[PDB]
Structure formats: C-alpha cells, structure tokens
C-alpha cells in the first residue's frame, strides 16, 4: 500500500471547502483564565507573562505550560499545548494563541491503541508529514500586531543569541517580502479568522535537528490553523496548504486514507525503512474525528506514528557526541557495536578539527558528522540500525 504519496498539491481541492469559524466568548475565556490562575497558585500549570515588543498598545500575553503527562488526566480546563491569553486595550480577555491539543504516539495511551483508534475514530484520515524543527505560532492581536511565538515563549532572548520565536519571525519576514505582503496584512487575516497559524521552523543554518533542511528546503512548514477558543477546532489540511500558498509558507505533505486498516498497513510498511517517496521521514501526524461514545458527537483528534529507526540511533549519536565533548559518560542504550565505532570515529574527527566541538554544541555539524561516519562505513543509516 505504498501507492499513496505525500502531496503538497491539495490547495486546488480547497476551492470546494470552507474554513471553520467560531468567535471567542469573553465569559468562557475569563472562566478558562480563572481556572488556569487557580491551578497556577498551588495538574500543575506555569504562567509566564511577556511584553509584545511590536504592540503600539503595550499588549502583554500570558503563556500557560503543563507537564506533558498531565494531559492524560481528565477534566483539564483545556488540552491546548501552547496557549497564550491576553487582555485587549479595551480590557476584553482573549485567547491570543492556541496550539493543537496534546497528542500521543500509538500505544502511549489507552486512546492510541489500534483497537481504541479502530473503535472510536472516523476518517477520512489525514496523514501529515511530521517535519523535524521547532513549533512556531502566529496570530493577530486586537490592536493589529502580528504575534510570533515559540511553544511557550515570544520576544528575543537577552543575549546576542536569537530566540526560536525571533528566528521564526525573520523567516516570516523573508517569505512575506517574496510574495509582496506585510505582517500587518497577515495579522488582520488571522484575526479575521480568529486563528493561530501553526508552523515548523526547519533551517540547518539556524539549528540542526535530525532530518536535514538545506537552504532550498529551509523555512516555516505550515502544518496547522487552529481556532482561538478553549475547544480544539483545526482546519482541514487542503485549506492549510491553500493558506500556505497565499502567505508564502512551505507546505506540509498530506495523504488522505479512508480506511483505518489501510492507515495501519501504510505506516507499518514505511516503519521498515524510515523513508517515503525518496525522502527520510521521522513520522506522521494522523488527524481525524473522535467520539467518547464508540458509535456520539465527534471532535478533531490527532495521534502520531513515529518511525523509531534510524532516527533513535541518530539522536543517540548526537547525545553521545555532546557527552564526549562535555566529559559526561555517553549513554549507549541501543546499537551498541556501531555506536562504539561511531564514538571512536567522532573522537578522531574532534582531534583533527578542534573547532568542531564548539560547533557541535551549537547544533552545527551534527548531521555532517553522522553522514561522514556512514560514508566511512559505506553504509546507509537504516543498514547501521539493522546490525543490532
Ligand atoms: N504535521 C504536523 N502536525 C502536527 N505537529 C507537527 C507536524 N509536523 C511537525 N509537528 C511537530 O510535532 C510536535 C508534536 O510532537 P510531540 O510528539 O507531541 C512532542 P515532540 O515532537 O517530541 O517535540 P517537543 O517535545 O520538543 O515539542 C508539534 O509541537 C510540532 O512542533
Ligand atoms: Cl463574528
Ligand atoms: Cl518545539
Ligand atoms: Cl476585531
């Protein structure tokens, strides 16, 4: 079932679709903030206040952070992962930024067992490529300011290091210049939609993760548009790809599969390789509708399917290399024999070029070192991960 290929050609099908829209209810927003404040004055939540530097009204936002395991509890005031609340210049309480609900990998929670999924969800199933960077949230404030956030933060960090949020905003400025639109226009459009744009910042020249994003592929991969309400309502992916084209984002590849057993089959087939349609793929985020009643009312619901290998091995090599440099014992947990060889190769590379240690610590040279060892071994990552 690898007839299915991730596509960024869906924007055309969006012509027949219409964006979900729900306005905010200030009373429900106030009640949510009250419940979050109470929680914070003791399911533990942390509040951080940020000034919006660009705001002509001196707007401030409160970022709310939960522990990822607390999302498994019932009766949370919200399941948003990334949530920023504000008061307008008029004293109205609003959600400024709303992330996706926390979602889990297969067999991580009762809800994400294949039996549970098969029973309680309905398709069509959107399989969205899981791009490997940091999350960026974009929204428009009541006063017209474009807000750009990382998962829990906004603004530049006090030193000469660029924050993730500022780096995201600099990519956004470039993509807007390219298509001839402004931050003001984007802020007005997101406010009109009562929406948060959800993107993955992927740029090796800024920070390396595991998958490579060279200059031609670097920027903001738009993977979501959420409504700024306590509930979770997200755009269908073809409308996300249409918004991506209109506002100069990179598109997130999409596969729509009707039948849940075909979804399972496809994902298991890719799991063998950890690659799809020529490219390395770290995972998929599967988007569908779920009902509490297994046969009631339906709500937008996500789960992920991570591909364990070779990406687990690569992450181990990165952490082992940073330990080597820092003097802490490398934690070898898997791929023991090939990792022993990698660490001797790494030690040789660091001895030959002593600049590399400081670069590796700043998340530059990590992918190159991994690929240099694999070339040295005349192996593909997938082969290296299969040895053990
Ligand atoms: N198509 C997509 N749909 C949804 N999320 C996507 C995505 N592509 C990438 N992502 C990223 O996947 C993240 C969710 O993954 P999770 O498994 O919940 C935590 P993670 O990916 O291990 O990273 P984190 O703990 O550093 O946030 C989102 O925060 C977003 O940054
Ligand atoms: Cl309205
Ligand atoms: Cl992140
Ligand atoms: Cl308004």
Author numbering: 13 to 54, 61 to 313, 315 to 407
What did the published study say regarding this structure?
The fungal tRNA ligase Trl1 (previously named Rlg1) is encoded by an essential gene and is involved in tRNA splicing and the unfolded protein response (UPR). Trl1 is a tripartite enzyme, consisting of an N-terminal adenylyltransferase domain (ligase; LIG), which belongs to the nucleotidyltransferase superfamily alongside DNA ligases and RNA capping enzymes, a C-terminal cyclic phosphodiesterase domain (CPD) and a central polynucleotide kinase (KIN) domain. This final reaction occurs in three nucleotidyl transfer steps: (1) Trl1-LIG reacts with ATP to form a covalent LIG-(lysyl-N)-AMP intermediate; (2) the bound AMP is transferred to the 5’ phosphate end to form a 5’-to-5’ RNA-adenylate; (3) Trl1-LIG catalyzes the attack by the 3’-OH on the RNA-adenylate to form a phosphodiester bond, releasing AMP.
While the full-length protein resisted crystallization, we obtained diffracting crystals belonging to space group P212121 of ctTrl1-LIG (residues 1 to 414) bound to the α,β-non-hydrolyzable ATP analog α,β-methyleneadenosine 5′-triphosphate (AMPcPP). The structure was solved by SeMet-SAD phasing to 1.9 Å resolution. The overall structure delineates two subdomains: an N-terminal (LIG-N; aa 13–326) and a C-terminal (LIG-C; aa 327–407) subdomain (colored blue and yellow, respectively). LIG-N is composed of three central antiparallel β-sheets surrounded by seven α-helices. The overall architecture of this domain resembles the bacteriophage T4 RNA ligase (T4Rnl1) structure consistent with it carrying the adenylyltransferase activity. LIG’s active site is buried in the center of a positively charged cleft that spans LIG-N and is extended by LIG-C. The adenosine nucleotide binding pocket is contained in LIG-N. In our structure, Nζ of Lys148 in the highly conserved nucleotide binding motif I [Kx(D/H/N)G], which is the site of covalent AMP attachment, is more than 4 Å away from the α-phosphonate, suggestive of conformational rearrangements necessary for the formation of the Trl1-(lysyl-N)-AMP intermediate. Thr146, Leu147, Glu149, Arg305 and Lys325 form contacts with the adenine base via hydrogen bonding, and His241 via π-stacking. Two conserved residues, Arg334 and Arg337, within an α-helix (α11) of the LIG-C subdomain coordinate a single well-ordered sulfate ion via salt bridges near the active site pocket.
